[PDB]
Amino acid sequence: MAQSTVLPMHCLYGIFLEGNLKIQKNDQEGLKKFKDNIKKFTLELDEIDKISPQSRIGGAICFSSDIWDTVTKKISKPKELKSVNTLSSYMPGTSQRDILIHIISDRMDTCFKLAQDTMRNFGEDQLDIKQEIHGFRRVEERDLTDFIDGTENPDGDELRTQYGLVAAGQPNEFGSYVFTQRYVHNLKKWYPEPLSVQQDTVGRTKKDSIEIPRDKRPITSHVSRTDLSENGKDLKIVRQSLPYGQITGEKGLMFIAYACSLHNIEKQLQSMFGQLDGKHDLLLKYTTPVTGSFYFAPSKKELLEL
Amino acid sequence: SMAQSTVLPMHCLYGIFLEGNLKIQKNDQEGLKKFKDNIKKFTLELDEIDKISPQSRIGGAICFSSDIWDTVTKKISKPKELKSVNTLSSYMPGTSQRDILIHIISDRMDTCFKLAQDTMRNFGEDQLDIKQEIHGFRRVEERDLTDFIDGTENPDGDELRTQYGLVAAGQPNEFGSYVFTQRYVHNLKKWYPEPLSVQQDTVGRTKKDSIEIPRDKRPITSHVSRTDLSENGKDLKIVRQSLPYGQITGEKGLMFIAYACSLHNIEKQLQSMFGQLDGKHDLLLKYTTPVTGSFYFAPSKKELLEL
Ligand code: HEM
Ligand code: HEM
Ligand code: NA
Ligand code: NA
Ligand code: NA
C-alpha cells in the first residue's frame, strides 16, 4: 500500500533527484500531463521489478508543503508537513524544494534507467532539478567515517511500518514524512583522531558497532543525540542514507529518513543542532549539511488520486 | 607471463578512472622508493579483493606516459611507440596528456570504490596530483548514452584479446598494453530529436539490435566506417573498456578507453575519425566532444613490479 522505498532494506544504490515544479497552479492541462508522468513512474517500477527481480527496485515521488495545493485539490495536506526552511535559524544548509524522486536498487543500471526514463518523461518543461546525487553502499555498509551506518535502523516490515508509515486509519495512512540532507565530510580532520575520540563521537565501537553504554559516552555523542524518547515512547525513524562523492573531491553522506511523524525527525534535528540544550552533536565537528528538505511521500493510492 | 588485469576480462559493470601527474622529482630516490611501495600495495590489494569478493571480478592497472617513463624507471626500456597525445593537438581537440592512469574495474561499485579509495590514500596528495576522477557505470543492454549498444565488435575471448590487446610474447615489454583515454561530453539535446535514419547513418549499425548497416548503404563517415580499419590485409582491432558516466540532469557522456598491442592501431583510428586520413570527420563528432585525452603504457605485471 506504501510506495516502495520505506520498507525494503540494504539497497546498494540510490539516486536522489530534488527540484521545483514549473507547472503553475491553474494550468490544468500541464497538471494532467504531470499526473500522467506520475502514473508512468509507478508502471515502470512494476515493469523493472518483473524483468529484474534481482534489482529489488524501489521508488517514491514526494511533495513539499509549499507545492501540495498546486498538485492536488482532493487529498488533504498532511498535518505535520512544513518547509524545512523554518529551521534555518539554527540548522545550516536548508534548501526546501518542491519535489523529491528517490529510487533504490541493488544494480546501478536499473537505478539509472528508471531515474533517466522518469526525468525524460517529466522533462525540463515540468521539473527544474536542483540536486542529483548518485549514492552507493560501501563495503560493510560503512559511512565514509568508516563506522557502520544502520545498526539500530528498525528491522522488518512490522517495525518499519510502525515507525516509517502513517498509521492505518489516520489521514494519509501509509504515506511517510521524508527528510533529505546532503552532508559534506571533512575527512582530513576525522582520520587523525584517535579511535577513542572517534568512538566517543559516534557512541558505538568502530569495528563491530557495539553500543557504548550511555553513562560512558558523552551526551553529545551522535547516538546520545538521536536515541530519543517522549512519554516513554521511542522516536524511531527509518533511514535510507548512502555515501556519495569523489575520492579526490567532495564526498559525504546523502542522508534520508522516512517517518510516521515528522516530529520524530525534527526532535532529533533540534537535539543535534543545539536547540534543546545548547550543545551540538560531536559529529558536526567533522561534517557539514549543505542541502535540506522536508517532503511527504503519499501512499500508492493517494499518489495516483492526486 | 601475466598482464595487468583490465585488458582481458569483459563486461565489467563499474569502472573508476584516475588520471593525474606525478609530484615526485627524478632525483628524489626516497620518494620514488615510496611510490614503488604503493604500486606493490595496489597489486597486493587487487589480489586480496579478488580472494574476498570473487563475484566482483575485480581488475586494475597502473599506466605511465612517455614523459614520465624515465622518472619512474632506469631499468625497463621505454615502449618503442609511446609518445604524448598532445602531439595530436593540431587536429584532435581536448588533448590533456597526464603522467599516470589508474583504471579499476568491478562488477560491484563497493569493491571498485574500496580499491580506488585505498589506493589514493596510500599514494596521497604529495605523490599524485589527480586531474580527473570518473565513475563509469554500465547501462541496461550495454548501451552508450546515444542508446546504441556499445561493444558489439569488441574482440571476444582471451586468445583474440591477447592478440589485439597485449604486446606479443618475445617482444620488448611483452604482455604490456598501449592505452588511450578520452572523455567525451555528449550533446543529447541535439541527438535525441534526430530521426532514426540519421542516428543509424551516424553510427553505422541499427539501434535496436546493433546489426551492421551494409557498407554500400552507409556513409563512409559513419562511425563504424571510420574505425573498422585494416592494413596489408590485417585488421587494426583494439580492446575497448569504455563506460558511460555523468548526470542525467547535467554533463554526461562516454569515458572512452582502449587497450592495444600497438599504439598505431589506436592512432590510425584517431587519424580516421578526426580528418587526417581523407579530410573527412566521423559523423558522431557532430553530437559529442572529446574534452580530455592521454596516451599511456600499462606494463606487464612483472615489469610493473620491477620498475
Ligand atoms: C553526517 C551525517 C551522519 C552520519 C555520518 C551518521 C552516522 C551514524 C552512525 C555511524 C550511526 C550508528 C549506527 C546506527 O545505529 O545506524 C548512526 C545512528 C543514528 N543516526 Fe546518524 N548519521 C548522520 C546524520 C544523522 C541525522 C541527520 C539523523 C537524524 C535526522 C540521524 C539519525 C540517526 C539515528 C536515529 C540513529 C540511531 C540511534 C539509535 O537509536 O541508536 N543521523 N548515525
Ligand atoms: C563518443 C564516443 C564514442 C561512442 C559513443 C562510440 C560508440 C560506438 C558504437 C555504438 C559502436 C558500435 C558497436 C560496437 O561494435 O562496439 C562503436 C564501435 C567502435 N568504436 Fe566507437 N564510440 C566512440 C568513440 C570511439 C573512439 C574514440 C574509438 C577509437 C579510438 C572507437 C573505436 C571503435 C571501434 C574500433 C569500434 C568497432 C568497429 C568495428 O570493427 O566494427 N570509438 N563505437
Ligand atoms: Na549495473
Ligand atoms: Na554492486
Ligand atoms: Na564521474
Numbering used by the authors:
A (entry chain A): 1 to 306
B (entry chain B): 0 to 306
Please share excerpts from the published article on this structure:
A novel cytoplasmic dye-decolorizing peroxidase from Dictyostelium discoideum was investigated that oxidizes anthraquinone dyes, lignin model compounds, and general peroxidase substrates such as ABTS efficiently. Dictyostelium DyPA is a dimer, with each monomer exhibiting a two-domain, α/β ferredoxin-like fold. In solution, Dictyostelium DyPA exists as a stable dimer with the side chain of Asp146 contributing to the stabilization of the dimer interface by extending the hydrogen bond network connecting two monomers. The active site of Dictyostelium DyPA has a hexa-coordinated heme iron with a histidine residue at the proximal axial position and either an activated oxygen or CN− molecule at the distal axial position.
The structure of Dictyostelium DyPA in complex with an activated form of oxygen was determined to 1.7 Å resolution. In the asymmetric unit, two molecules of Dictyostelium DyPA were found. The Fe (III) is hexa-coordinated and is in the plane of the porphyrin ring. The heme group has His222 on its proximal side, and the distal side is occupied by Asp149, Arg239, Ser241, Leu253, and Phe255. The sixth coordination position at the distal face of the heme iron is occupied by an activated oxygen molecule with elongated bond distances between the oxygen atoms of 1.7 and 2.4 Å in the two monomers. The observed distances between the coordinated oxygen atom and the heme iron in the two monomers are 2.3 and 2.6 Å. The other oxygen atom is coordinated by a hydrogen-bond network that involves Asp149, Ser241, an ethylene glycol, and water molecules. Electron density analysis revealed excess electron density on the Nδ atom of His222 imidazole, which exceeds the maximum level of electron density on the carboxyl group of Asp281 by ~1σ. This observation suggests that the imidazole ring of His222 is negatively charged in the crystal structure of the Dictyostelium DyPA:O2 complex, while the carboxyl group of Asp281 is protonated. The negative charge on His222 explains the elongated bond length in the activated O2 molecule by the decreasing effect of an additional electron on the energy difference between the highest occupied (HOMO) and lowest unoccupied (LUMO) molecular orbitals of the complex. Arg239 forms hydrogen bonds with the distally positioned heme propionate, Asp149, and the O2 molecule.
